[PDB]
C-alpha cells in the first residue's frame, strides 16, 4: 500500500496522511502510530473508530482507492511514523503501507553547544574520542566543523541526529572526533565550531587538553 | 468500508 | 499487566538458525490468533506469520515460507518463531502481535516491544562505557559514551529510570572499525553537579553486558 | 453468571407495537455485536437483526426492515428490539444472541432463554390450576391440569425446582374455546404419598399469574 | 440452507446430518443443538471445532455444496434439533438451515397407564376434564379410546405427546376427555382403553364416579 | 472451509 514518505504540518494545523491501494475503500483500514524505538500503537481502526485513550483529533476515512488518516490540531506529541494496514483475503496476508513520517514545523531555535574531552579511562586504551553536542535546535540542518590547533579537521569525525523531540519539536546532534592517543597528545586546542540558522554568527566551543 | 466482508478486486 | 514480551534475539550467523519466544501475560492467550511482524532497521512494518488458536492453521509471508516455522504452547502462554537459513534480509526487529477483529476488520491490538535479530558472521562484542563529564547558562551537560559494540542494540537509562527529562540517546553510528558507537547525554541544572548523583545504565543484551557508570566533574 | 435475559414478551395486538429488552450480565457488553434471532412455534431459527458495538451500524432481515428497530444501551448493558406494525408472521420466541468469531467464522456463542411474542387481538387470560390426584406397581402418578389460558406459554416446576426426575410437562393443546390447556405430571414412589408434599408451581408470565397447588390423594 | 427434516439412528451408532447450499464449502459452517423449549447451543463451529464441554463424538466437515454434522456413538441425550448456520456477506445476513430432528431408535416399551377423575375444584365451574396418562412408551404411535358407561366416545377428547425423553428415549402421552358437569354426572363408568405395540392386548384403566 | 474470507459464489 502506498504512503507519502513524509508530511509536515504547523502546530494546531491539520495533517493528512493518505494510503493508496486498488479498491481499498471496499474493505476496512487500520492505522498504527510508531514513535522511534517504540512498538506500533493503534490510533484508528475499522476505517474511522478510535481506541479508548486516543484523542478525538485522530480521524480516518476510506473510499475508492485511498484511505486517509487525519490529525487535527497537531502537536509535538504527534510526531511519529504512521502505517495503514489491511488484511488481504486472496493470499491470507496482512498488508502494511510503506509508512509516513509526520514532522511538526516550529520556529528556528539555536543549539546549546557543549564540548567533552576524552575521559582518562579511554586514553589508557590508546584512543581519544572528542564529543561535540548540539542540544535542542531547529531546523535539523547544521554544520559542525572540528578544529585542532586551528587546523580544520576532515575525514575523522561522525555525526548522529535525534528524531524530533516529542515536546518541543527540536533536534539534537552529537559529533565525535576520533584520534589515536598519540595524535591526541600531539596537539593542544580542541575546538567545535557550529554554524546554524538560529545563530547570527558561528559558535565555537573549545578546551585546552590538560585542565 | 465498514463491512465484515473481506474481498477486494 | 496485559503484555507480550519477545526474547531470543541477538546475533546469528548466515545460514544458521534462531528461535524467538514470545511470552504473553494478562489475557487468555489460547483465545487469540497470534502473529510475528518484523521491521528491518529504518524500514517499514512487514507481516511475517499468523498462527490459529489451536496451533495448526498457519500463514506465512512468501519470503520466509520454507525457512520459518511459527508455533505455540498455550499451556505456557507462549508464541515461537523458528528461523532457519537466515540471511541479511531477515535482519530486523521482530514483534510479537495479537490478532483481533472488534467491529469489522482484523488488526493487531497488542504488540510486544520487539527484539532485534542481526544476521552476521561476526562475534558479539560488549561495549566500553566512558563518561562525558560536565564542564563546571544555569544548565550543564553530561553523559556516557558507549563505544565499540556489536551487534545493535544498546539501551541507556539514567539513574535507573528516575532521570528522563532532557535525556537524548543518539542513534548509533557505524564506525570505520565496523563496530557501533552511541552517546547518551542529559542536561541538568548546574547547581546539582556537586549534589545529585548521575549514573548511566547501559544494557547490551546481545552480549549480556550491563554497565553502570557514574559521571562527575573532575577538577 | 455469563448470561443474556430477554423480557417484554407476551400478547400484542396486530398493527400495534412491542419493545423487547435484553439484559446482559457477566461480560463486557460493549465489546460485542449483538443480535436478535426468532423462532415461530414449531419452526426453524430465523435471524432478525445485528447491532454493532457502538450502536449505529445495524443489519435487518428483509421481512422486518422498516418495522423493527434494533438499539442498545452499553451503559445499561442492554439490547432492545422495537417492533412495530406486528402481524401473525411475527409471532415467535425472540432470542437475544451474542456475536463472536473465534478462529474463522462469525456465529452466536451465547444465547438467552428467549421470550414468546404472540400477535393476537385477544386479551390475556391467566389459567386455572386443578390437581391430578394419585390413586392410592410401586409407582403412583400425580400432576396438575393447567386450563384455559392465553397466550402461550405456561411453565410448570415441581416443589420449587427440587423435583425433576420423572416429570413430564406436555405441549399445550389448543381447545375448541380457543384457549390453551396443558398437563404436567410426575411419577413418584407410592410409599411417599402420605409422606412427601407435592406442589406444582405454575407460571403464566403473559398475565403475570403464578399459582402453586399441592396435590394429595383424597380418600 | 437445506437439511433433512429428520434422521434416526440406533444407540451407539452414527448420525449424519447434512447441510446443503451452493458453494457452502467455501466458507465456515457452524452447528447448533436445540433441545425442546431450550436455547440453541453451539456444538460444532468453524466447520469442525468443538467448544469446551462438547463430547468428541460430535464432529463436522464441510466441502463442495454440503456441510455435515456427524454424531458418533449416539445416546439418548443427543436427541434434539440441529441447525447449521453460515454468514452471508452479500446481503449482510446470518443464514440458518431448516433444521434436523434426531430421533434415537430403541426397543418397544409398553406404557404405564393412569386415569385421573376431574377435581372437585373444577366441577364447581361446570366442566369435567378426565385425563388419561400413557407414561414412557415406544414407539410413539398409540391408540387411546375413551369409553363412558361402555359407550365409545368420539369428538370430545384431545391428545398431547412429549418429545423423546432425553434419558430412556421414550414418549409420554396425555389424553383429556372434556364434558360439561351436567353430562359428567349423567354417567358412572369412565374408562381409558390403550392399544399399543408393547401391549399383547389392550389395557383399560377406569374409575367409578364417586369414590 | 476453515478460512477468514467471506465470499461465496
Coordinates of N, CA, C and O in Angstrom, one line a residue, chain D residues 40-167:
Chain D
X40 N -40.6 -19.1 15.2 CA -42.0 -19.2 15.3 C -42.3 -20.6 15.8 O -41.5 -21.5 15.6
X41 N -43.4 -20.8 16.6 CA -43.8 -22.1 17.2 C -43.6 -23.3 16.2 O -44.2 -23.3 15.2
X42 N -42.8 -24.2 16.6 CA -42.6 -25.4 15.8 C -41.8 -25.1 14.5 O -41.8 -26.0 13.6
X43 N -41.2 -24.0 14.4 CA -40.5 -23.7 13.1 C -39.0 -23.6 13.4 O -38.5 -23.9 14.5
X44 N -38.2 -23.2 12.4 CA -36.8 -23.1 12.5 C -36.3 -21.7 13.0 O -37.1 -20.8 13.1
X45 N -35.0 -21.7 13.3 CA -34.4 -20.4 13.7 C -34.4 -19.4 12.5 O -34.1 -19.8 11.4
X46 N -34.6 -18.2 12.8 CA -34.6 -17.1 11.8 C -33.9 -15.9 12.3 O -34.3 -15.3 13.3
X47 N -32.8 -15.5 11.7 CA -32.1 -14.3 12.1 C -32.9 -13.0 11.9 O -33.6 -12.9 10.8
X48 N -32.9 -12.1 12.8 CA -33.7 -10.9 12.8 C -32.9 -9.6 12.6 O -33.1 -8.9 11.6
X49 N -31.9 -9.4 13.4 CA -31.1 -8.2 13.3 C -29.7 -8.2 14.1 O -29.6 -8.9 15.1
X50 N -28.8 -7.5 13.6 CA -27.5 -7.3 14.3 C -27.3 -5.8 14.7 O -27.7 -4.9 13.9
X51 N -26.6 -5.6 15.8 CA -26.2 -4.2 16.1 C -24.7 -4.2 16.5 O -24.3 -4.9 17.4
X52 N -23.9 -3.3 15.8 CA -22.5 -3.0 16.1 C -22.3 -2.6 17.5 O -23.2 -2.1 18.1
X53 N -21.1 -2.7 18.0 CA -20.8 -2.3 19.4 C -21.2 -0.9 19.7 O -21.6 -0.7 20.9
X54 N -21.1 0.0 18.8 CA -21.3 1.4 19.1 C -22.7 1.9 18.7 O -23.0 3.1 18.7
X55 N -23.6 0.9 18.3 CA -25.0 1.2 18.2 C -25.6 1.8 16.9 O -26.8 1.9 16.8
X56 N -24.7 2.1 16.0 CA -25.2 2.8 14.8 C -25.3 1.8 13.6 O -26.3 1.8 12.9
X57 N -24.2 1.1 13.3 CA -24.3 0.1 12.2 C -25.3 -1.0 12.6 O -25.1 -1.6 13.6
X58 N -26.3 -1.3 11.8 CA -27.3 -2.3 12.1 C -27.7 -3.0 10.8 O -27.8 -2.4 9.7
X59 N -28.0 -4.3 10.9 CA -28.5 -5.1 9.8 C -29.8 -5.7 10.1 O -30.1 -6.1 11.3
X60 N -30.7 -5.9 9.1 CA -32.1 -6.4 9.4 C -32.4 -7.5 8.3 O -32.1 -7.4 7.2
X61 N -33.2 -8.5 8.8 CA -33.9 -9.3 7.9 C -34.8 -8.5 7.1 O -35.4 -7.5 7.6
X62 N -34.9 -8.7 5.8 CA -35.8 -8.0 4.9 C -37.3 -7.9 5.4 O -37.8 -6.8 5.4
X63 N -37.8 -9.0 5.8 CA -39.2 -9.0 6.2 C -39.5 -8.1 7.4 O -40.7 -7.9 7.7
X64 N -38.5 -7.6 8.1 CA -38.8 -6.7 9.3 C -38.2 -5.4 9.1 O -38.4 -4.5 9.9
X65 N -37.5 -5.2 7.9 CA -36.9 -3.9 7.6 C -38.0 -2.8 7.4 O -38.9 -3.0 6.7
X66 N -37.9 -1.7 8.2 CA -39.0 -0.7 8.2 C -39.9 -0.8 9.4 O -40.4 0.2 9.8
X67 N -40.1 -2.0 9.9 CA -41.0 -2.1 11.1 C -40.2 -2.4 12.4 O -40.7 -2.0 13.4
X68 N -39.1 -3.0 12.3 CA -38.3 -3.3 13.5 C -37.1 -2.3 13.7 O -36.4 -2.0 12.7
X69 N -36.8 -1.9 14.9 CA -35.6 -1.2 15.2 C -34.8 -1.8 16.3 O -35.2 -2.0 17.4
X70 N -33.5 -2.2 16.0 CA -32.6 -2.7 17.0 C -31.8 -1.6 17.6 O -31.3 -0.7 16.8
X71 N -31.6 -1.5 18.9 CA -30.8 -0.5 19.5 C -30.2 -1.0 20.8 O -30.5 -2.1 21.2
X72 N -29.3 -0.2 21.4 CA -28.6 -0.7 22.6 C -28.2 0.4 23.5 O -28.0 1.5 23.1
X73 N -28.0 0.0 24.8 CA -27.5 1.0 25.8 C -26.4 0.3 26.5 O -26.6 -0.5 27.4
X74 N -25.2 0.6 26.1 CA -24.0 -0.1 26.7 C -23.8 0.2 28.2 O -23.5 -0.6 29.0
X75 N -24.1 1.5 28.6 CA -24.1 1.8 30.0 C -25.0 0.9 30.8 O -24.7 0.6 32.0
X76 N -26.1 0.5 30.2 CA -27.1 -0.4 30.9 C -26.9 -1.9 30.6 O -27.6 -2.7 31.1
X77 N -25.9 -2.1 29.7 CA -25.6 -3.5 29.2 C -26.9 -4.1 28.7 O -27.2 -5.2 29.0
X78 N -27.6 -3.4 27.8 CA -28.9 -3.8 27.4 C -29.1 -3.7 25.9 O -28.6 -2.7 25.2
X79 N -29.8 -4.7 25.3 CA -30.1 -4.7 23.9 C -31.7 -4.5 23.8 O -32.4 -5.1 24.6
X80 N -32.1 -3.8 22.8 CA -33.6 -3.6 22.6 C -34.0 -3.9 21.2 O -33.3 -3.8 20.2
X81 N -35.3 -4.4 21.1 CA -35.9 -4.6 19.8 C -37.3 -3.9 19.8 O -38.2 -4.4 20.4
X82 N -37.4 -2.8 19.0 CA -38.6 -2.1 18.9 C -39.4 -2.7 17.7 O -39.0 -2.5 16.6
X83 N -40.5 -3.4 18.0 CA -41.3 -4.0 17.0 C -42.6 -3.2 16.7 O -43.4 -3.0 17.6
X84 N -42.7 -2.8 15.5 CA -44.0 -2.0 15.1 C -44.7 -2.8 14.0 O -44.1 -3.6 13.2
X85 N -46.0 -2.4 13.8 CA -46.8 -3.0 12.8 C -46.8 -4.5 12.8 O -46.6 -5.1 11.7
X86 N -47.0 -5.1 14.0 CA -46.8 -6.5 14.1 C -48.0 -7.3 13.4 O -49.1 -6.8 13.4
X87 N -47.6 -8.4 12.9 CA -48.6 -9.3 12.3 C -48.4 -10.8 12.8 O -47.4 -11.0 13.5
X88 N -49.2 -11.7 12.3 CA -49.1 -13.1 12.8 C -47.8 -13.7 12.4 O -47.4 -14.6 13.1
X89 N -47.2 -13.3 11.4 CA -45.9 -13.8 11.0 C -44.8 -13.5 11.9 O -43.7 -14.0 11.8
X90 N -45.0 -12.5 12.8 CA -44.0 -12.1 13.7 C -44.1 -12.8 15.1 O -43.3 -12.7 15.9
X91 N -45.2 -13.6 15.2 CA -45.4 -14.4 16.4 C -44.2 -15.4 16.5 O -44.0 -16.2 15.6
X92 N -43.4 -15.4 17.6 CA -42.3 -16.2 17.7 C -41.6 -16.0 19.1 O -41.9 -15.1 19.8
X93 N -40.8 -17.0 19.4 CA -39.8 -16.8 20.5 C -38.7 -15.9 20.0 O -38.2 -16.2 19.0
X94 N -38.4 -14.8 20.7 CA -37.3 -13.9 20.3 C -36.1 -14.2 21.2 O -36.2 -14.0 22.5
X95 N -35.0 -14.6 20.6 CA -33.7 -14.8 21.3 C -32.8 -13.6 21.2 O -32.6 -13.1 20.1
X96 N -32.2 -13.2 22.3 CA -31.1 -12.3 22.3 C -29.8 -13.2 22.1 O -29.7 -14.2 22.8
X97 N -28.9 -12.8 21.2 CA -27.7 -13.6 21.0 C -26.4 -12.8 20.8 O -26.4 -11.7 20.1
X98 N -25.3 -13.2 21.4 CA -24.0 -12.6 21.2 C -23.3 -13.1 20.0 O -23.2 -14.3 19.7
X99 N -22.7 -12.1 19.2 CA -21.9 -12.4 18.0 C -20.4 -12.7 18.4 O -19.9 -11.9 19.1
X100 N -19.8 -13.6 17.8 CA -18.4 -13.9 18.0 C -17.7 -14.6 16.8 O -18.4 -15.5 16.2
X101 N -16.5 -14.2 16.5 CA -15.7 -15.1 15.6 C -14.4 -15.4 16.4 O -13.7 -14.5 16.9
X102 N -14.2 -16.7 16.5 CA -13.0 -17.1 17.3 C -11.9 -17.3 16.3 O -11.0 -16.4 16.2
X103 N -11.9 -18.4 15.5 CA -10.9 -18.7 14.5 C -11.2 -18.1 13.2 O -10.5 -17.2 12.7
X104 N -12.4 -18.4 12.6 CA -12.7 -18.2 11.2 C -14.0 -17.5 10.9 O -14.0 -16.6 10.1
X105 N -15.1 -18.0 11.5 CA -16.4 -17.6 11.1 C -17.3 -17.0 12.2 O -17.2 -17.5 13.3
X106 N -18.1 -16.0 11.8 CA -19.0 -15.4 12.8 C -20.1 -16.3 13.1 O -20.8 -16.8 12.2
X107 N -20.4 -16.5 14.4 CA -21.5 -17.2 14.9 C -22.0 -16.6 16.2 O -21.6 -15.5 16.6
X108 N -23.0 -17.3 16.8 CA -23.6 -16.9 18.1 C -23.1 -17.7 19.2 O -23.5 -18.9 19.3
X109 N -22.4 -17.2 20.1 CA -21.7 -18.0 21.1 C -22.4 -17.9 22.5 O -21.9 -18.5 23.5
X110 N -23.4 -17.2 22.6 CA -24.2 -17.0 23.8 C -25.6 -16.7 23.5 O -25.9 -15.7 22.7
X111 N -26.6 -17.4 24.1 CA -28.0 -17.2 23.8 C -28.8 -16.9 25.1 O -28.4 -17.4 26.1
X112 N -29.8 -16.1 25.0 CA -30.8 -16.0 26.1 C -31.7 -17.2 26.1 O -31.7 -18.0 25.1
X113 N -32.6 -17.3 27.0 CA -33.6 -18.4 27.0 C -34.8 -18.1 26.1 O -35.6 -18.9 25.8
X114 N -34.9 -16.8 25.7 CA -35.9 -16.4 24.8 C -37.2 -16.0 25.4 O -37.6 -16.5 26.5
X115 N -38.0 -15.2 24.7 CA -39.3 -14.8 25.2 C -40.3 -14.8 24.1 O -40.0 -14.4 22.9
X116 N -41.5 -15.3 24.3 CA -42.5 -15.5 23.3 C -43.4 -14.3 23.1 O -44.0 -13.9 24.0
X117 N -43.4 -13.8 21.9 CA -44.3 -12.7 21.5 C -45.5 -13.3 20.7 O -45.3 -13.9 19.7
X118 N -46.7 -13.1 21.1 CA -47.9 -13.6 20.4 C -48.7 -12.4 19.9 O -49.3 -11.6 20.6
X119 N -48.8 -12.3 18.5 CA -49.6 -11.3 17.9 C -51.0 -11.8 17.8 O -51.3 -12.7 17.1
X120 N -51.9 -11.1 18.5 CA -53.3 -11.6 18.7 C -54.2 -10.5 19.1 O -53.8 -9.6 19.9
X121 N -55.5 -10.5 18.7 CA -56.4 -9.5 19.0 C -57.0 -9.7 20.4 O -57.7 -8.8 21.0
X122 N -56.8 -10.9 21.0 CA -57.4 -11.3 22.2 C -56.6 -10.9 23.5 O -55.4 -10.9 23.5
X123 N -57.4 -10.7 24.5 CA -56.9 -10.3 25.8 C -56.2 -11.5 26.5 O -56.5 -12.6 26.2
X124 N -55.2 -11.2 27.3 CA -54.5 -12.2 28.1 C -55.5 -12.8 29.0 O -56.5 -12.2 29.4
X125 N -55.3 -14.1 29.4 CA -56.1 -14.8 30.3 C -55.3 -15.8 31.1 O -54.7 -16.7 30.5
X126 N -55.2 -15.6 32.4 CA -54.5 -16.5 33.2 C -55.2 -17.8 33.4 O -56.4 -17.9 33.2
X127 N -54.5 -18.9 33.8 CA -55.0 -20.2 33.9 C -55.7 -20.6 35.2 O -55.4 -19.9 36.2
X128 N -56.5 -21.6 35.1 CA -57.0 -22.2 36.4 C -56.2 -23.5 36.5 O -55.9 -24.2 35.6
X129 N -55.7 -23.8 37.8 CA -54.9 -25.0 38.0 C -55.7 -26.0 38.9 O -56.1 -25.7 40.0
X130 N -55.8 -27.2 38.4 CA -56.6 -28.2 39.1 C -55.6 -29.4 39.3 O -54.8 -29.7 38.5
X131 N -55.8 -30.1 40.5 CA -55.0 -31.2 40.8 C -55.3 -32.5 40.0 O -56.5 -32.8 39.8
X132 N -54.3 -33.2 39.6 CA -54.5 -34.6 39.1 C -54.0 -35.5 40.2 O -52.8 -35.8 40.4
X133 N -55.0 -35.9 41.1 CA -54.7 -36.6 42.3 C -54.4 -38.1 42.1 O -55.1 -38.8 41.4
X134 N -53.4 -38.6 42.8 CA -53.0 -40.0 42.7 C -54.0 -41.1 43.2 O -54.6 -40.8 44.3
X135 N -54.1 -42.2 42.5 CA -54.9 -43.3 43.0 C -54.1 -44.1 44.0 O -53.1 -44.8 43.6
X136 N -54.5 -44.1 45.3 CA -53.8 -44.8 46.3 C -54.5 -46.2 46.6 O -55.5 -46.5 45.9
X137 N -47.4 -50.0 39.8 CA -46.8 -51.0 40.7 C -45.6 -50.5 41.4 O -44.5 -50.5 40.9
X138 N -45.8 -50.0 42.6 CA -44.8 -49.4 43.4 C -44.7 -47.9 43.0 O -44.2 -47.1 43.8
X139 N -45.2 -47.6 41.9 CA -45.2 -46.2 41.3 C -46.6 -45.6 41.2 O -47.5 -46.2 40.6
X140 N -46.8 -44.4 41.8 CA -48.0 -43.6 41.6 C -47.8 -42.4 40.8 O -46.7 -41.8 40.7
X141 N -48.8 -42.0 40.1 CA -48.8 -40.8 39.2 C -49.6 -39.7 39.8 O -50.7 -39.9 40.2
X142 N -49.2 -38.5 39.6 CA -49.9 -37.3 40.1 C -49.5 -36.1 39.2 O -48.5 -36.2 38.5
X143 N -50.3 -35.0 39.3 CA -49.9 -33.8 38.5 C -50.9 -32.7 38.6 O -51.7 -32.6 39.5
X144 N -50.7 -31.7 37.7 CA -51.6 -30.5 37.7 C -52.1 -30.3 36.3 O -51.4 -30.6 35.3
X145 N -53.4 -29.9 36.2 CA -54.0 -29.6 35.0 C -54.1 -28.1 34.9 O -54.8 -27.4 35.7
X146 N -53.5 -27.5 33.9 CA -53.4 -26.0 33.7 C -54.3 -25.6 32.6 O -54.1 -25.9 31.4
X147 N -55.4 -25.0 32.9 CA -56.5 -24.9 32.0 C -56.9 -23.5 31.6 O -56.9 -22.6 32.4
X148 N -57.2 -23.3 30.3 CA -57.9 -22.1 29.8 C -57.1 -20.8 30.0 O -57.5 -19.9 30.6
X149 N -55.8 -20.8 29.4 CA -55.0 -19.6 29.4 C -54.7 -19.1 28.0 O -54.9 -19.8 27.0
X150 N -54.3 -17.9 27.9 CA -53.9 -17.3 26.6 C -53.1 -16.1 26.8 O -53.4 -15.3 27.8
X151 N -52.1 -15.8 26.0 CA -51.5 -16.8 25.0 C -50.5 -17.7 25.7 O -50.5 -17.8 26.9
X152 N -49.8 -18.5 24.9 CA -48.6 -19.3 25.5 C -47.6 -18.3 26.0 O -47.6 -17.1 25.6
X153 N -46.6 -18.7 26.8 CA -46.5 -20.1 27.4 C -46.8 -20.2 28.9 O -46.8 -19.2 29.6
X154 N -47.1 -21.4 29.4 CA -47.1 -21.7 30.8 C -45.8 -22.5 31.1 O -45.4 -23.3 30.3
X155 N -45.2 -22.3 32.2 CA -44.1 -23.2 32.7 C -44.6 -23.8 34.0 O -45.3 -23.2 34.8
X156 N -44.2 -25.0 34.2 CA -44.5 -25.7 35.5 C -43.2 -26.3 36.0 O -42.5 -26.9 35.3
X157 N -43.0 -26.1 37.3 CA -42.0 -26.8 38.0 C -42.7 -27.6 39.2 O -43.9 -27.4 39.4
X158 N -41.9 -28.4 39.9 CA -42.5 -29.2 41.0 C -41.6 -29.0 42.2 O -40.4 -29.2 42.1
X159 N -42.2 -28.8 43.3 CA -41.5 -28.5 44.6 C -40.4 -27.4 44.4 O -39.2 -27.7 44.7
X160 N -40.8 -26.3 43.8 CA -39.9 -25.2 43.5 C -38.6 -25.5 42.9 O -37.6 -24.8 43.0
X161 N -38.6 -26.6 42.1 CA -37.4 -27.0 41.4 C -36.7 -28.2 41.9 O -35.8 -28.8 41.2
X162 N -37.0 -28.7 43.1 CA -36.4 -29.8 43.7 C -36.7 -31.1 43.0 O -35.9 -31.9 42.8
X163 N -38.0 -31.2 42.6 CA -38.5 -32.4 41.9 C -38.3 -32.3 40.4 O -39.1 -31.5 39.8
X164 N -37.4 -33.0 39.8 CA -37.2 -33.0 38.4 C -37.3 -34.4 37.7 O -37.7 -34.5 36.6
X165 N -37.0 -35.4 38.5 CA -37.0 -36.8 38.0 C -38.4 -37.3 37.7 O -39.3 -37.2 38.6
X166 N -38.6 -37.8 36.5 CA -39.9 -38.4 36.2 C -41.0 -37.3 35.9 O -42.2 -37.7 35.8
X167 N -40.6 -36.1 35.7 CA -41.6 -35.0 35.3 C -41.8 -35.0 33.8 O -40.9 -35.0 33.0

